[PDB]
UniProtKB/Swiss-Prot annotation, chain A:
Record's catalysed reaction(s): L-seryl-[protein] + ATP = O-phospho-L-seryl-[protein] + ADP + H(+); L-threonyl-[protein] + ATP = O-phospho-L-threonyl-[protein] + ADP + H(+)
UniProt-annotated catalytic positions: 129 (proton acceptor)
Modification after translation: Thr-161 phosphorylation and Tyr-8 dephosphorylation promotes kinase activity.
GO MF annotations in UniProt: ATP binding; cyclin binding; cyclin-dependent protein serine/threonine kinase activity; FBXO family protein binding; protein serine kinase activity
Alphabetical keyword list: Acetylation, ATP-binding, Cell cycle, Cell division, Cell projection, Cytoplasm, Cytoskeleton, Differentiation, Disease variant, Kinase, Nucleotide-binding, Nucleus, Phosphoprotein, Primary microcephaly, Serine/threonine-protein kinase, Transferase
N6-acetyllysine modified-residue sites: 241
Protein encoded by which gene: CDK6
EC number of this enzyme: 2.7.11.22
The organism of origin for this protein: Homo sapiens
Residues where ATP binds: 27
Modified residues (Phosphothreonine): 33, 54, 161
Name of the protein in question: Cyclin-dependent kinase 6
UniProt domain Protein kinase: residue ranges: 4-277
Something else known: Over-expressed in some leukemias and malignancies (including sarcoma, glioma, breast tumors, lymphoma and melanoma) as a consequence of nearby translocations.
Curated annotation (Swiss-Prot), chain B:
PROSITE patterns: CYCLINS
InterPro entries: Cyclin, Cyclin-like_dom, Cyclin-like_sf, Cyclin_dom_herpesvir, Cyclin_herpesvir, Cyclin_N, Cyclins_cyclin-box
Protein's name in the database: Cyclin homolog
UniProt keyword list: Cell cycle, Cell division, Cyclin, Host-virus interaction, Modulation of host cell cycle by viral cyclin-like protein, Modulation of host cell cycle by virus
SUPFAM superfamilies in UniProt: Cyclin-like
Function description: May be highly relevant to the process of cellular transformation and rapid T-cell proliferation effected by HVS during latent infections of T-cells in susceptible hosts.
Keyword Secreted: no
Family the UniProt entry places it in: Belongs to the cyclin family. Cyclin D subfamily.
One Pfam family here: Cyclin_N
Coiled coil ranges: none
Length: 277, 243
């Protein structure tokens, strides 16, 4: 706000007056003066970040401040500043030379992104919005989980709204309007995994109903005991047909994350204990 | 509404370990509301039971109240509170806390039409945020409920009721001032034992746990035993009439 120059709101990267022209990314959150105070999310978002900040976990973005300038004239405005990073896992791919990232640069990020995820879960936090747009990439190739405004502390018998993750990266459980939990991040991972080996969203879809099938046409059709007769019974067509250029190990990893029954779907913890690494 | 079931990767591994670690994040209040110059402990208890009631009557999630309590106190360290204002403050707290810990938030209208202006409230909410520096979330007694059950080996089959029955008592207890001095870990342990002592419900004699919990949480068995008493008392002193 006061000493900040910017080169539900726009994500403007900016340079702070204090630090050596440092880059303090600004996320000006808008608070429509209706009747509810600070946006419900811009709170849980900063809440979780402020809570776990003392651990300074490598694979997580760093929040610096929440300006907030009260205005007697018009409504107040929010200046949410984090640490600046060059490109989101998306950009990196749109501009990554052919053929995309190397089986090594790929294996790394997946280890990190999965590492930070493992961390986040240990503190009962479920970041419910994992997508390329929400991952960050340091110029040196490190991962930073971001846009935490969907993440929340998950506790037993907690109430839930089955509206998690952007259509594409949504896990089966959240599409069938059923109950969800942590595996919601592992699935959202498999997707981001496949989407690296081949800079293209493994499960594009138009509706929830459609989003489910596209996913079913790829991973196949689970049994009765892996289901919480609508969709079809087609033989899961080898993934090597959907994700181009993948190791035999990585093969297993993606099929460990993109499992239907979340009760089986590998955990961020052991996923790091997986051979592919 | 769909409600969260188990999730071993959040209920069965080294998490007490971090809960504890993060418990040790916010220093113990040497003396509850030590900085207050106008409102008192007595004032807090009264307000807290009006808040407890706000959540119970509107069925918010169990970890809402314990967090609104948490917010309120951390807030009433930095800034000062007045009786003519406590109502507002306490209300703000819940609002924030519900926004965080609960899927169905406590709308302002529904919280002002129960007291200040629906705007002066928004302010007080804000005044609490920047003061606490948007660092609201915290370790609740409630967060230890399952993890503690897990570690004590309490058979999964009972977790539902135990959680429900204990989370309840821990909430009223939290109303009392003597409890605000204790660690969320202990408070939870106390409330589990307390609760466990109401229709065995297939649980061992509460006895058997005291020594494990001493080992689990790392406290003298005496301390555990005491907090069970302590909690089972604040639980008792619950009294709607005080309003």
């Amino acid at each position: 706000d006061q000493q900040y120059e910017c080169v539900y709101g726009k994500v403007f990267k900016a340079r702070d007056l204090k630090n050596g022209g440092r880059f303090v990314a600004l996320k000006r959150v808008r608070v429509q003066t209706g009747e509810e105070g600070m946006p419900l999310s811009t709170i849980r978002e900063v809440a979780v970040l402020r809570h776990l900040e003392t651990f300074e976990h490598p694979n997580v973005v760093r929040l610096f401040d929440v300006c907030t300038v009260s205005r007697t004239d018009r409504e107040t405005k929010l200046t949410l500043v984090f640490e600046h990073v060059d490109q989101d896992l998306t950009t990196y791919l749109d501009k990554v030379p052919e053929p995309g990232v190397p089986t090594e640069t790929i294996k790394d990020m997946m280890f990190q992104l999965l590492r930070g995820l493992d961390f986040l879960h240990s503190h009962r936090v479920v970041h419910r919005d994992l997508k390329p747009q929400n991952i960050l990439v340091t110029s040196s190739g490190q991962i930073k989980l971001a846009d935490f405004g969907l993440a929340r502390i998950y506790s037993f018998q907690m109430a839930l709204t089955s509206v998690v993750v952007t259509l594409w990266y949504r896990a089966p459980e959240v599409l069938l309007q059923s109950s969800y939990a942590t595996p919601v991040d592992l699935w959202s991972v498999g997707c981001i995994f496949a989407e690296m080996f081949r800079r293209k969203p493994l499960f594009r879809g138009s509706s929830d109903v459609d989003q489910l099938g596209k996913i079913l046409d790829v991973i196949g059709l689970p049994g009765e005991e892996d289901w919480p007769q609508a969709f079809h019974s087609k033989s899961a067509q080898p993934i090597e047909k959907f994700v181009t250029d993948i190791d035999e190990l990585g093969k297993d990893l993606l099929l460990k994350c993109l499992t239907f029954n979340p009760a089986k779907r590998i955990s961020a913890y052991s996923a790091l204990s997986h051979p592919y690494f | 509404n769909r409600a969260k079931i188990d999730s071993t990767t959040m209920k069965d591994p080294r998490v007490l370990n971090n809960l504890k670690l993060r418990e040790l994040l916010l220093p113990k209040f040497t003396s509850l509301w030590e900085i207050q110059t106008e409102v008192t402990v007595d004032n807090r208890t009264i307000l807290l039971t009006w808040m407890h009631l706000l959540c119970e009557s509107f069925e918010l999630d169990k970890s809402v109240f314990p967090l609104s309590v948490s917010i309120l106190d951390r807030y009433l360290c930095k800034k000062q509170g007045t009786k003519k204002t406590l109502q507002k403050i306490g209300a703000a707290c819940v609002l924030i806390g519900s926004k965080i810990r609960t899927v169905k938030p406590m709308t302002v209208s529904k919280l002002t039409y129960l007291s200040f202006t629906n705007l002066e409230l928004i302010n007080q909410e804000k005044d609490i945020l920047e003061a606490l520096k948007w660092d609201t979330e915290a370790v609740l007694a409630t967060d230890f409920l399952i993890p503690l059950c897990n570690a004590l080996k309490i058979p999964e089959d009972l977790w539902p009721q135990l959680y429900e029955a204990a989370s309840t008592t821990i909430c009223k207890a939290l109303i009392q001032p003597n409890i605000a001095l204790l660690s969320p870990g202990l408070i939870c342990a106390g409330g589990l034992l307390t609760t466990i002592e109401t229709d065995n419900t297939n649980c061992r004699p509460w006895t058997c746990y005291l020594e494990d919990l001493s080992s689990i949480l790392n406290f003298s068995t005496n301390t555990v035993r005491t907090v069970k008493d302590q909690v089972s008392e604040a639980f008792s002193l619950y009294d709607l009439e005080i309003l």
